[PDB]
Design a protein around this ligand. Structure first.
Ligand SMILES: O=C(O)Cc1ccc(O)c(O)c1
Ligand SMILES: O=C(O)Cc1ccc(O)c(O)c1
Ligand SMILES: O=C(O)Cc1ccc(O)c(O)c1
Ligand SMILES: [Cl-]
Ligand SMILES: [Cl-]
Ligand SMILES: [Fe+3]
Ligand SMILES: [Fe+3]
Ligand SMILES: [Fe+3]
Ligand SMILES: [Fe+3]
Lengths: 200, 238, 238, 200, 238, 200, 200
């Protein structure tokens, strides 16, 4: 059969991933421009939301050295690929878990609906890639919203998960943090309540 | 805004390291036990950030000068250079390449590294660059030293530099580690050996590149990166 | 006083490097053009200094501590250890082993070295030791970096440590250079290649020695040295 | 035939040999005890002599980075192998050429006569091994004395040199340096007046 | 009392059998699922009991006489002898070697063995010895027979003798099984095959040793044992 | 790299380990001297204690054919390697689980404090090696004591266990048994509450 | 290591090099445009000079079939690569030795100063490549000028020649020839006074 050049193989990002990709977290000075966890400036259109979460291993212990990358549509359901710290909104961001508490945060807007390749609307989602010590190739997941039940029920991606119980692992929980709209999205890498991870 | 106009060759997850590789002990509790769920590519997966207008500092790619505290860092001066292409052999221009590493003695500038080898006051350990219009990147740095770690009772990482590459979509994004030609620690490392296929391990070994060296100044290593092949859509929804 | 009681196996001067090895440019004018004159061994050649009562300082074999100016040197912490034997396999006890090297960046602490890589304020580059009663020695140091030099227009020494060994007589005294397992610079070096026989080159390559490492601390390399075989006189002047 | 373990092959001592073997010359601090160029303390028996010399390459230019080791009998023709800086005499010493002038010096006594293995007396001599950048394996020679003409003429080692002219290359020239007895012994590695080098 | 002045070469746990070897069915529930935690050697690990003054009975090493109930046991009379050394080749003198086995028919003298082959009234199946000053031990016994067991539906152990060896510390202590040269059951046994590397399996196969036999009396097998290499500490806490 | 002679590979001790190492348990006559579970005679200095425990497999069932070797310091924190049945105290002993109840016992004294190689004090502990049918290479663990909580908190070995919850698996529970101080130390080879096992 | 395509190996230009590169010298008709030994027309700015020289082999005999290519800056110290016979000055030229007298000549202007890559000024020089029968790969040298002694003393290229005596081999001697400034630059391929040849 036809064989292409093989892809460069993945390796773990390691425990010191912050040196390279989360400079403040390593305890190091930052450069003039850094790619970080504030996707939306205050005057970006859409519903402004705080996202937060913890990451658990198979023994139910916090993964305190997690590194996360996120990709989401703007409030109008459009992906903005021209990354610029001047923009009121960027579709891409990065975050990491605190070493003490194990919590990551993101400041963004709720993404609008995007259609799949067949033209079927997907429920509002944030694409997440998870990297860490002990993770040899990053894990892909999606964060959906518990206040989008009707859309979630119809999502052609959610519906590819064979067991209904597992779909629940991708639904973030709406709450309030200091009077502001928030969602919690915990990830369980392994075992009871294991988060669905995707291949594509 | 970005649009869905391409498809990316499916990953070979027997070429990449598997999730559960128990000799690398931390992988035991940090690997999923359920199968990954395969989904079709949509605009969510086939698009990604372009960093053309991220503002890079003058020395962002030069680790000999980007942590200057009154001198040059100690250790083997090297250029690390290469090309980013996809599996069809097409260059990947204007893509973000990030790298980080320990110093010459295997000590990382990170609050969590307590290895007894000293920090170097003029070494930070982080670089970034955008590939040029032909897919080439280059960094100047010092060769990192091996690093012991608490895996088995006498485990030592080979000299290595971490690389992160964005590529054209979140589907192509990759983090990997570069190793150095001939390092006798490579065959012994449980992180290297998370990769089952020895031919895949070879793909991570940077080759000494005398052709690219600066005489009386610095050596050079070459590390080419291959991201997932990108093709146009064809015969979809018909 | 010393006495003539032994004979030393004749050197193989096709195993050692020849004098004239023109790719190593300085050898051209510094090699004799007349043949060496062979002479029989006498007490002049078959005796030599014993250094049992030379007074060694506490850190003479420890380059991590013998140039202490307020910290540890930067670079790959290693033990260099091995055995000195003769060609009959007999150990050479209580013999003087001296070594010197550049720092982690290939810079020598010598007024004549102007290579632009910095000096390390806590690294000197010299050690000495006496082999023990079983012929073993050991040093602790940092792995030296490669060094460019004005031979050809882009010539670089592999990482190396100089060794001098006295042995039992002036006939056994040797200076050589240790190289490190896997170093891709070794096949390219005109000083290495002054040795014509590739099997002889292999004898100068120290092997990674995980068995002798200190976990979470330092790696180790093993370098065994073979001096000329020593035998008793037999059937002389009869 | 019988083949033993091969000897470790020689390599050049290199231009920075002084780092290891001539600490002051490199411009570095010395240790408590160093092996150097004073074989005899003032009260050693025998005729006290200064030795000095320059080393030339094949183009007649000074070899300014030469390193020399010497081995000689005491005034009574006995080799003293128990090296100790307390001793009034040591049979072994080391010297090196100055980088500016190219001259080495030794402070010693004139060695007494030593017999070869056949019982034949050799003329007074100092054994010398020469190391340097560009010298892949050290060169062995002997320094004999011009005021020992009768002994020199009868030396069984000198007489192994086939051409009389070449024997003259091993005879050092008596002079006076600040009213003290001295001998000059220049070495020519290559070409006109090339010094005899030995294999044994 | 005991002192911490030695270190032992780290075990290769891919040379040893892994814990989880599912074809050996009882290992499935009796293997840890979490990684072992590496700890540095301290005096707790690098010391162990010395049995120089344990009181041995006259027949402790002689299974032909140590269960005497009126006659000799039935079966193939053999000496089992060999040397205990460490990985550096150093003999391990005055060390405890214990062994036990089934009888000629594969029946064990243990209340839990209900195999239908009969017990032998003059065979018990246990020996012990201290190695001599040069590391050698010797037993006289009957060659054990193969033993069926409830693993797969038709599994049979090859003839085997269990060995336990103390060595110089609790870090060296080992239990293993000796197998016999040429036994066609060896490649089929899921306990043998718990060892992944076939070269490691070969290390457990005792060789027929005619040189050590007693003519007209008993054959002999040779089984040498290698314990972890022992070295002195070097460059610790400095 | 340097490759030494390979170590002889381990194999399971098998279900009849008792034949060789626990003679009584096998149902068999004992020899005049046996290595067994009484490390301390009444006259030994220190605090006399009973240790007991059960061993569980991954399904929570008793491992009724376990064989254990123990190694501990005397009450002064000194290891006594000169094994002799005449001694009031031996640092080494052996025990096995009953086939009926599955319980092992040991009679000993509480060990004193021992420093690690770096001079940092370790909390009082018993080193244990566990052998059985189904265990291909013996499992190493340590028994610490719950009446040493303050010392356990600072032990440099316990502190190498990354998760605090896992350290609890090594802490034996003090009780009284027929008026004598006892500690229970149960071992779980696999699954919920899995006992920490060491490599060194 | 990285291995590129190997360069095409050199071979001698042979004794009939003139057929291809010095047409007149061969005895043959010339084409309308030839690359030859007049780098400067009378109108070129700078100091007009004649260069001449002879080439000697290792036995001190003339090399009568030498072919030389030269490359030099204009009087401003700028290299002019746009070769054109219409130009008042060209940086490149060719010459050959007469078969009779063995002398080559060049008509040019004195080049201005050029900095090395490190910004340090090089003394005025002509780069020369020498080809002939018996020369397997051409020999590179530089012609410097004896009326530039102070500049020559500081040239970072001349100062890479370790021995001062060898630097003298590159210094052409100023004379007057038919009332015009001339310099003689003789080349000795081998032996006494051997001309320095470069690799780069
Ligand atoms: O977990 C640790 O002890 C630290 C560690 C191990 C391996 C690596 O490559 C690294 O960067 C850091
Ligand atoms: O001659 C030089 O440029 C210096 C030099 C070259 C090679 C070496 O190994 C060395 O130690 C020094
Ligand atoms: O499976 C059991 O419990 C019985 C058994 C099997 C294999 C053996 O080697 C042995 O001694 C006993
Ligand atoms: Cl191309
Ligand atoms: Cl030996
Ligand atoms: Fe790392
Ligand atoms: Fe050198
Ligand atoms: Fe069995
Ligand atoms: Fe021709």
């Amino acid at each position: 059969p036809i064989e292409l050049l093989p892809e460069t193989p993945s390796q773990t990002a390691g425990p010191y991933v912050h040196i390279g990709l989360a400079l403040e977290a390593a305890g190091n000075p930052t450069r003039d421009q850094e790619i970080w966890n504030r996707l939306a400036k205050p005057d970006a259109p859409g519903e402004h939301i705080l996202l937060l979460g913890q990451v658990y291993d198979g023994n139910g212990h916090l993964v305190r050295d997690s590194f996360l990358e996120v990709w989401q549509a703007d409030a109008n359901g459009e992906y903005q690929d021209a990354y610029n710290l001047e923009n009121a909104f960027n579709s891409f961001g990065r975050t990491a878990t605190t070493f003490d508490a194990g919590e990551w945060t993101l400041h963004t807007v709720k993404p609008g609906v995007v259609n799949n390749a067949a033209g079927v609307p997907m429920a509002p989602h944030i694409n997440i890639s998870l990297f860490a010590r002990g993770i040899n190739i990053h894990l892909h997941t999606r964060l959906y919203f518990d206040d989008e039940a009707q859309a979630n029920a119809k999502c052609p991606v959610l519906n590819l998960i064979e067991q209904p119980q597992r779909r629940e692992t991708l639904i973030a929980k709406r709450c309030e943090v200091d009077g502001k709209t928030a969602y919690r999205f915990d990830i369980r890498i392994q075992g009871e309540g294991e988060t669905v991870f995707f291949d594509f | 805004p970005a649009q869905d106009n391409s498809r990316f060759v499916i990953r070979d997850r027997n070429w990449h390291p598997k999730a559960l590789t128990p000799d690398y002990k931390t992988s035991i509790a940090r690997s999923p036990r359920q199968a990954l769920v395969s989904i079709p590519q949509s605009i969510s997966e086939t698009t990604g950030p372009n960093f053309s207008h991220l503002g890079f500092g003058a020395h962002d790619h030069d680790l000999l000068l980007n942590f200057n505290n009154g001198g040059l860092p100690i250790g083997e001066r090297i250029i690390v250079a290469g090309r980013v292409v996809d599996q069809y052999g097409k260059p990947v221009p204007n893509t973000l390449v990030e790298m980080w590493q320990a110093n010459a003695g295997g000590r990382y500038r990170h609050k969590n590294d307590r290895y007894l080898a000293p920090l170097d006051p003029n070494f930070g350990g982080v670089g970034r660059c955008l590939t040029d219009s032909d897919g080439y990147y280059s960094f100047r740095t010092i060769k990192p030293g091996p690093h012991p770690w608490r895996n088995g009772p006498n485990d030592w990482r080979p000299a290595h530099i971490y690389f992160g590459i964005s590529g054209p979509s979140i589907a192509t994004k990759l983090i990997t580690q570069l190793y150095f030609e001939g390092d006798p620690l490579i065959p012994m490392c449980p992180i290297v050996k998370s990769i089952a296929n020895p031919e895949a391990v070879q793909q991570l070994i940077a080759k000494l590149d005398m052709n690219n060296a600066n005489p009386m100044d610095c050596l050079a290593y070459r590390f080419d990166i291959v991201l997932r092949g990108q093709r146009k859509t064809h015969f979809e929804n018909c």
